[PDB]
A paper describes a structure:
When activated, CaM binds to and stimulates the activities of a family of Ca2+/CaM-dependent serine/threonine protein kinases (CaMKs), thereby regulating their functions. However, the regulation mechanism of CaMKI remains elusive. Here we report four crystal structures of three truncation variants of human CaMKIα, namely CaMKI320 (residues 1–320), CaMKI315 (residues 1–315), and CaMKI293 (residues 1–293), which correspond to the aforementioned three truncation forms of CaMKI, respectively. The catalytic core of CaMKI takes a canonical bilobate architecture, with the N-terminal lobe (N lobe) consisting of five antiparallel β-strands and a prominent helix named helix αC and the C-terminal lobe (C lobe) comprised primarily of α-helices.
In contrast, in our CaMKI320, the P-loop takes a canonical conformation, the C-terminus of the regulatory region (residues 300–320) is undetected, and the nucleotide-binding site is amenable to nucleotide binding. More intriguingly, the C-terminal part of the activation segment encompassing residues Pro171 to Thr181 assumes a unique helical conformation (designated as helix αT) with well-defined electron density (an average B factor of 39.8 Å2) and the DFG motif at the N-terminal part of the activation segment takes an “in” conformation. The rare helical conformation of αT is stabilized by the hydrophilic and hydrophobic interactions within the activation segment and with the surrounding secondary structure elements including helices αEF and αG and the αEF-αF loop. Specifically, the hydroxyl of Thr177 (the phosphorylation site of the activation segment) forms hydrogen-bonding interactions indirectly with the hydroxyl of Tyr195 (a strictly conserved residue on the αEF-αF loop) and the main-chain carbonyl of Met168 via a water molecule, and the hydroxyl of Ser173 forms a hydrogen bond with the main-chain carbonyl of Lys167. In the apo CaMKI320, Lys49 interacts with Asp162 and Phe163 of the DFG motif of the activation segment. Concurrently, helix αC is rotated outward and Glu66 points its side chain away from the catalytic site, making it impossible to interact with Lys49. Whereas in CaMKI320, the activation segment including helix αT and the β8-αT loop occupies part of the catalytic site. Although unphosphorylated, the side chain of Thr177 (equivalent to Thr309 of Akt/PKB) is oriented inwards and forms interactions with the surrounding residues to stabilize the specific conformation of the activation segment, shielding it from surface exposure and hence from CaMKK phosphorylation.
Author numbering: 10 to 53, 62 to 299
The structure:
């Protein structure tokens, strides 16, 4: 729990890697070592969440290198993960399959399972928070940010609702409290997008959009889902279940054939998935 009188004396900042509610991840360089880092800045129990995060050690989760305090400000220095955004790198691929998506999901699931074993809920499981570790083709994906406890706060909840409503669970939208299920939902949503390239929830009208999410009203639309195995759909349905109790846990999703068996198809779906990714996430 390092102390700093001025955070600008340790790090020079560039720009936002991904804002949150009470939090802003900015890229920074360590003034006296020149190391590029991701800095989760927060200003206002939660320091226990952050403590535990500092002890988080997993290949698929960004290492929280250390934490800086500046009187009224905490700066979570995360390992900078510069392989690219999940969807960006899916687009860049040539050969993209369910197996790739399954291997991507397995990594997020295993990472989220880890967080859940340690009783930490992500809360902010979104593709912008899922980055490749390296620019390499085979690279592991990293959960690169965290939703801190003060995301459960109703102000943050509605901010989450107003941001990209598609990645947030039905319960969270219902102003019902966060749970480990919330993450699994988001893995389901990520899974869904990994296999078609578009949000499962996509109405032009906000009200209808929330209605879709709250009621988990999504479909595996043709043509996009035609070459996607029923196994993959089954997997998503059990993650993308409106009832958080009915929703699969990380373990249950990790034990699912599309993740643990050989049911993820080897059919190249890149052309369609990237075609849809570009059409949604520019």
């Amino acid at each position: 729990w390092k102390q700093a009188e001025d955070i600008r004396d340790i790090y020079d900042f560039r720009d936002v890697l991904g804002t949150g509610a009470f939090s802003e991840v900015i890229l920074a360089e360590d003034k006296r070592t020149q190391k590029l880092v991701a800095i989760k800045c927060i200003a206002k129990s939660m320091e226990n969440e952050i403590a535990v995060l500092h002890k988080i050690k997993h290949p698929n989760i960004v290492a929280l290198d250390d934490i800086y305090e500046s009187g009224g400000h905490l700066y979570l220095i995360m390992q900078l993960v510069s392989g690219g955004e999940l969807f960006d790198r899916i687009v860049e691929k040539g050969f993209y399959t369910e197996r790739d998506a399954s291997r991507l999901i397995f990594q997020v699931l295993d990472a989220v399972k880890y967080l859940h074993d340690l009783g930490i809920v992500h809360r902010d499981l979104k593709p912008e928070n899922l980055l490749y570790y390296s620019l390499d083709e085979d690279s592991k994906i990293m959960i690169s940010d965290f939703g801190l406890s003060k995301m459960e706060d109703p102000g943050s909840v509605l901010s989450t609702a107003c941001g990209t409503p598609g990645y947030v669970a039905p319960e969270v939208l219902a102003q019902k409290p966060y749970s480990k299920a919330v993450d699994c939902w988001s893995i389901g949503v990520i899974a869904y997008i990994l296999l078609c390239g578009y949000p499962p929830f996509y109405d032009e009208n906000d009200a209808k959009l929330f209605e879709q999410i709250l009621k988990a009203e999504y479909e595996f639309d043709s043509p996009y889902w035609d070459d996607i195995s029923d196994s993959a759909k089954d997997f998503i349905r059990h993650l993308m279940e409106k009832d958080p109790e009915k929703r699969f846990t990380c373990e249950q999703a990790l034990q699912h054939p599309w993740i643990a068996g050989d049911t993820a198809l080897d059919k190249n779906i890149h052309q369609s998935v990237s075609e849809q990714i570009k059409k949604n996430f520019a």
